[PDB]
Amino acid sequence: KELNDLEKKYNAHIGVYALDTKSGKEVKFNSDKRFAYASTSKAINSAILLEQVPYNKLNKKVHINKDDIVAYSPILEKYVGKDITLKALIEASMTYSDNTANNKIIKEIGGIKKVKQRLKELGDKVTNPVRYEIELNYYSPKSKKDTSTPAAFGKTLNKLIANGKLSKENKKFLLDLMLNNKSGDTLIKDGVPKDYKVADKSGQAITYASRNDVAFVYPKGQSEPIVLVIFTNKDNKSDKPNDKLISETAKSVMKEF
Amino acid sequence: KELNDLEKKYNAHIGVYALDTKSGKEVKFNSDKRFAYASTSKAINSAILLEQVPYNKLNKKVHINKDDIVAYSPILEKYVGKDITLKALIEASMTYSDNTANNKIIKEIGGIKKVKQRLKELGDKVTNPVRYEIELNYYSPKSKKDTSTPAAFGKTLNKLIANGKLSKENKKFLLDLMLNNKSGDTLIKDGVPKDYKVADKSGQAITYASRNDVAFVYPKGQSEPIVLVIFTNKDNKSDKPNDKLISETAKSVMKEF
Numbered sequence: 001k002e003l004n005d006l007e008k009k010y011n012a013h014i015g016v017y018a019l020d021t022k023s024g025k026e027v028k029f030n031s032d033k034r035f036a037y038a039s040t041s042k043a044i045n046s047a048i049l050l051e052q053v054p055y056n057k058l059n060k061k062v063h064i065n066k067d068d069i070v071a072y073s074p075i076l077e078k079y080v081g082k083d084i085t086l087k088a089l090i091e092a093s094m095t096y097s098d099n100t101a102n103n104k105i106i107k108e109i110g111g112i113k114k115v116k117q118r119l120k121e122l123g124d125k126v127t128n129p130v131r132y133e134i135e136l137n138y139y140s141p142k143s144k145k146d147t148s149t150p151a152a153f154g155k156t157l158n159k160l161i162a163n164g165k166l167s168k169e170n171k172k173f174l175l176d177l178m179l180n181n182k183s184g185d186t187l188i189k190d191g192v193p194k195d196y197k198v199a200d201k202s203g204q205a206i207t208y209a210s211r212n213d214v215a216f217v218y219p220k221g222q223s224e225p226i227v228l229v230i231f232t233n234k235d236n237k238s239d240k241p242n243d244k245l246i247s248e249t250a251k252s253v254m255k256e257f
Numbered sequence: 258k259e260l261n262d263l264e265k266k267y268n269a270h271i272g273v274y275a276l277d278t279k280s281g282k283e284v285k286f287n288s289d290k291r292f293a294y295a296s297t298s299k300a301i302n303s304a305i306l307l308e309q310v311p312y313n314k315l316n317k318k319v320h321i322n323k324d325d326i327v328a329y330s331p332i333l334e335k336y337v338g339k340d341i342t343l344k345a346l347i348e349a350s351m352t353y354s355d356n357t358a359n360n361k362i363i364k365e366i367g368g369i370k371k372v373k374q375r376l377k378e379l380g381d382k383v384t385n386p387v388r389y390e391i392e393l394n395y396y397s398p399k400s401k402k403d404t405s406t407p408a409a410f411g412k413t414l415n416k417l418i419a420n421g422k423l424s425k426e427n428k429k430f431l432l433d434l435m436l437n438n439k440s441g442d443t444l445i446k447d448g449v450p451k452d453y454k455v456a457d458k459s460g461q462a463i464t465y466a467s468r469n470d471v472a473f474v475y476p477k478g479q480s481e482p483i484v485l486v487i488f489t490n491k492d493n494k495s496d497k498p499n500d501k502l503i504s505e506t507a508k509s510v511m512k513e514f
């Protein structure tokens with residue numbers, strides 16, 4: 001339905017970028033307006049590591065101490081003084097949105113500067129990672145940090161993942177995780193036609209009801225995915241989000257393909 | 258290695274019950290001593306629902322309100338005022354150890370009395386569920402509540418799941434979740450031979466460093482599983498656990514098969 005009355009109905013701000021990878025058709029809406037990506041970003045870092053270490057070599061183990069640990073690390077919280085593979089870091093970041101995992105992933109990639117570096121290669125001028133977890137999810141309308149526009153985010157997802165340089169194996173490992181993740185069932189997955197396949201990574205910033213869902217959406221009987229970025233936020237710092245907002249946005253946009 | 262020097266080395270209390278379903282061979286240790294099962298119990302309730310609703314009918318939706326919500330419900334915490342299927346309740350309980358999910362599952366089964374009822378049918382005289390989440394994980398050496406012995410727990414897992422009445426579909430849905438769960442990689446999975454398959458559900462009570470791992474373990478090249486229950490605890494209320502304890506217990510016990 002109209003995104004505008006979604007915005008009215010929900011009293012929210014919608015940012016949408018959809019790309020049909022088969023056809024190259026796009027559906028934009030508030031497309032160049034900046035929003036906090038929060039955890040959606042875990043998919044990018046993940047893919048960036050994935051490019052740099054073959055599947056066979058994800059068994060590689062890294063050491064975690066107490067200094068490594070940040071909030072909301074359901075998986076990694078138990079690894080103080082132990083090793084975890086690259087494989088399990090990604091699993092934890094992707095399925096559980098594990099904040100230490102993400103941090104260690106950026107670290108393995110070579111830090112934020114390395115991410116910044118990749119982005120630019122991708123011709124991603126907008127995505128602006130500045131902080132580490134959990135501060136990278138601390139949205140303020142007044143700051144550009146850890147923001148992107150649905151378009152820049154979307155273009156990058158396309159370039160890294162869908163039409164990227166990943167190996168069969170690495171591409172499959174990453175997409176499966178995004179496909180199996182039950183974490184965002186109330187988001188895009190909730191709004192698409194019944195026999196569609198959704199490989200997403202959701203996110204939520206602490207403030208302004210910042211709620212997001214990013215996905216590779218496979219139409220019932222379609223191999224190439226539709227890249228879908230939906231960012232949402234609201235007026236007040238303490239506003240809570242309505243996930244049904246994203247579900248209904250997804251529902252509408254999908255109509256156009 | 259010897260469980261006794263595991264116990265010395267870790268200054269912990271070990272409770273082990275292993276059953277080779279092929280052969281019927283058991284490995285017991287402090288087998289009839291009671292421990293808090295905590296989240297391991299999510300597997301039982303899950304299986305109990307699974308017996309009662311065909312796979313095709315897990316799409317069945319149930320309504321969650323705010324009254325339903327308990328602590329540490331990473332999935333269900335977002336469902337206030339919405340419906341979730343039976344399928345996704347189980348997914349959330351199993352993969353994320355989702356406390357509201359578990360609660361709603363027991364509720365769908367018909368409550369604790371119904372669980373108590375099933376147990377007895379199973380000839381499970383010991384497992385003593387008394388509370389709901391999150392209190393069912395509040396261990397005290399002095400209370401029997403939400404306790405079982407590695408044997409009674411183990412026997413029941415065998416009877417419900419391994420050698421149970423589940424359908425192909427329901428049995429596969431449940432085992433896959435336990436197999437895909439990266440949550441207990443530092444436990445049993447950490448101690449078994451490299452090419453073994455482990456379908457577990459881990460748990461941890463608030464006190465006495467109560468740490469557990471329950472699994473269906475498939476020897477590299479073996480179809481029938483070994484049922485493995487490892488319960489561990491320590492002397493002081495505020496003791497924290499060493500997961501490596503379970504990994505090394507698993508490592509040892511597996512030697513015998």
Ligand SMILES: *C(=O)/C=C\N[C@@H](C(=O)O)[C@@H](O)CC=O
Pocket residue numbers: 037038039040072096097137183184201202203204205331
């Ligand atoms: C990240 O910005 C927001 C949420 N990540 C979530 C997810 O992917 O499920 C999450 O559950 C972790 C805490 O919100």
Ligand SMILES: *C(=O)/C=C\N[C@@H](C(=O)O)[C@@H](O)CC=O
Pocket residue numbers: 074294295296297329353354394440441458459460461462
């Ligand atoms: C239950 O008694 C203890 C832990 N459940 C965990 C699991 O299965 O991963 C968990 O992560 C939830 C909070 O400890």
Ligand SMILES: O=C/C=C/NC[C@H](O)CC=O
Pocket residue numbers: 037038039040072097099134137202203204205206
């Ligand atoms: O969007 C991704 C969120 C991931 N981790 C949970 C938090 O960071 C808690 C709020 O800061």
Ligand SMILES: O=C/C=C/NC[C@H](O)CC=O
Pocket residue numbers: 294295296297329354356391394459460461462463
């Ligand atoms: O063992 C399973 C634990 C599951 N949920 C987390 C808690 O209950 C937190 C401690 O009470």
